């Protein structure tokens with residue numbers, strides 16, 4: 001009878017990543033509306049896909065006009081204007097050069113896979129560098145180089161809070177890279193996949209200067225540098241593109257989630273020679289469909305119009321300030337990290353040992369949900385709170401979210417172990 | 427203010443292009459695409475079958491606008507949401523079905539087919555697959571994976587081992603199964619009308635028989651209806667013409683009536699075997715879900731399978747008259763508004779007329795008609811228009827098609843060469 005019960009009866013568990021019985025019938029701004037009418041503040045923004053929140057007027061206007069008069073439904077066998085305009089608008093925002101083209105998909109998973117397959121096709125080099133704990137997607141293609149393909153080389157992420165080999169600079173990781181590359185035929189690696197802030201590892205910001213150095217090693221060895229900005233892309237970091245923080249330009253940019261503002265949309269920006277090496281090669285019927293592209297353009301127009309990178313920079317300091325405020329009261333909070341409105345809070349059993357507090361995290365978000373706050377956890381040990389709110393979240397929503405979070409830290413023990421065992425999580 | 431099509435060439439890479447002619451679209455209304463210059467073309471492609479309700483259908487507009495205005499979140503991964511749930515129930519209500527099956531939502535047929543395969547392997551441990559030569563299950567690593575028993579599709583127009591019944595294909599199948607350990611094959615993937623093969627309806631009874639053999643061996647029957655499902659065949663589900671019910675149904679294309687939306691209908695045990703297993707962030711998103719609902723609602727409300735059956739026969743009847751005037755036409759085939767026309771150099775030899783097929787669609791494009799070719803040989807014109815296409819739209823496209831056949835020589839080899847196509 002209840003919506004959550006009906007979901008359990010109609011929808012298989014295969015795609016479920018449930019942390020609590022959240023059941024939604026509506027949405028407005030940064031709020032989700034449960035079946036009964038209860039309002040929750042969404043600090044997850046659907047893992048960041050709701051870039052502009054819910055029922056944003058520019059999304060509404062864009063998608064309504066597109067549905068009323070659609071330019072076909074595909075970029076495959078026809079050129080359509082909404083997609084072409086979005087392609088140029090994405091091209092404009094990327095420097096360079098260039099000589100770059102767009103490939104459109106439904107998701108970050110299909111875009112990382114396309115990027116890979118295009119590289120191997122265009123160059124003949126099938127080897128891949130990727131980072132341990134990396135999330136590039138859940139398709140057979142994009143999982144092949146995600147964390148636990150032949151010629152896959154996995155490197156530790158440059159994690160300040162847990163430095164590889166206890167070297168805080170990351171120099172040991174670059175040294176490992178170097179040892180790994182010479183154990184493998186010269187010119188055999190075609191690509192290096194990089195998250196500028198590692199999402200699934202625990203929203204990890206790498207040590208300053210590391211990515212630039214890593215890219216320089218890559219460029220010196222013929223290896224194309226692919227920046228997977230699905231989670232942290234498009235203004236979320238407080239800059240239009242997250243690599244703008246790291247003093248390097250990737251050869252390839254992968255975009256997703258927040259790009260569609262609520263509709264399935266991803267994109268690969270890659271040199272023309274990579275995307276033109278084949279035709280009818282990586283394709284799905286509704287790729288570059290006009291309704292998705294219209295929303296995508298409404299996201300970009302709104303980013304520019306509202307200076308959303310500047311907003312995300314502002315609202316992110318406000319959010320991190322408040323979280324530090326909570327650390328001063330709650331010993332579980334070991335680490336606050338992030339850029340713009342991509343923030344991570346690591347919870348630990350002891351601030352010195354930095355041992356992961358998995359059970360408390362699960363109880364925390366469950367309680368948070370009961371209090372009216374939607375936040376999920378992420379990370380290797382399930383101990384990292386992830387904050388990726390709508391970019392249009394108001395300061396008033398953030399203060400309210402902080403008060404509810406404070407309350408959830410204090411009221412955590414209320415959550416029974418059997419309540420938590422109802423929900424498999426990751 | 428360059429040409430739209432030239433702007434396309436400069437911004438959008440070739441990787442996903444399946445281009446046969448310089449079609450550049452700025453609008454759509456019913457079964458008509460509106461090019462940049464304001465010429466309306468009758469769409470016989472319906473975007474490979476995705477535009478099941480055509481362009482600007484009121485039901486899609488109402489549902490999409492309302493969903494955009496008040497979205498129940500953006501995902502089904504981490505929240506339950508009402509639109510996704512309502513649509514899942516509705517799809518299960520359309521299948522038999524009750525308490526045995528569950529729904530998994532995707533973006534596309536490729537991911538839906540990939541999810542079905544991964545779920546089966548995970549749930550049953552049986553990684554072995556049976557599939558048909560020339561099958562199209564999608565264009566991702568996961569969906570092009572299908573260890574493998576490959577069979578010829580039973581094509582009445584091109585029989586296997588000189589057996590038009592198709593019984594030699596059932597005999598080959600029996601041999602391959604006997605040759606490999608019992609319980610090593612988990613799934614059989616079937617198109618009940620083979621799309622990439624060139625819209626082939628198999629001989630009567632073959633699939634029913636094929637399904638028996640599978641169940642006899644503990645093999646799950648997966649019916650891939652991404653192209654040909656949802657009212658398109660003259661029934662809601664194409665397997666209803668075939669006297670069997672599949673264990674798993676894959677749905678896509680027309681399902682979103684223009685938005686990306688796919689679905690797998692599978693036994694609960696297959697879909698409940700693991701969690702956080704096959705998932706992408708925008709899966710089950712409410713704007714696609716609402717669009718799926720509008721499609722299912724319109725199908726029932728405007729009796730679209732019956733309309734497809736009517737308009738299909740009228741379309742194929744018209745094409746038989748073209749065959750009386752144009753010797754190129756060798757076989758007209760299909761169910762409902764999913765039809766194929768195989769073009770041959772001799773009706774006895776059944777030798778494929780590839781070169782002439784390309785010119786035909788190029789020519790037809792110039793005339794105001796959107797239509798494409800498929801098949802291993804590039805000689806079968808696919809007809810998959812909006813289930814909404816009008817009786818007037820059909821007659822009008824038949825005249826244009828007639829005119830296209832008469833004017834093939836007007837299109838040169840150098841014009842054909844400018845478009846890479848398949």
Ligand SMILES: *Cc1c(COP(=O)(O)O)cnc(C)c1O
Pocket residue numbers: 106107108109110112135136137138195199228229230231256257705706707708
């Ligand atoms: C979410 C994400 C993906 C995959 O996107 P989906 O829409 O879930 O397929 C890939 N890479 C990163 C870094 C992501 O965050």
Ligand SMILES: *Cc1c(COP(=O)(O)O)cnc(C)c1O
Pocket residue numbers: 283284285286533534535536537539562563564565617621650651652653654678679
């Ligand atoms: C189109 C199609 C697919 C794949 O759908 P995409 O959206 O193109 O990935 C799979 N099977 C059949 C029969 C199809 O027609």
Ligand SMILES: O=C1CCCCCN1
Pocket residue numbers: 076283284285444474562621
């Ligand atoms: O019908 C199809 C499948 C969709 C991808 C383009 C090829 N043709």
Ligand SMILES: O=C1CCCCCN1
Pocket residue numbers: 017047135199200503705706707
């Ligand atoms: O951050 C992510 C990627 C989106 C899919 C759900 C898993 N978590």
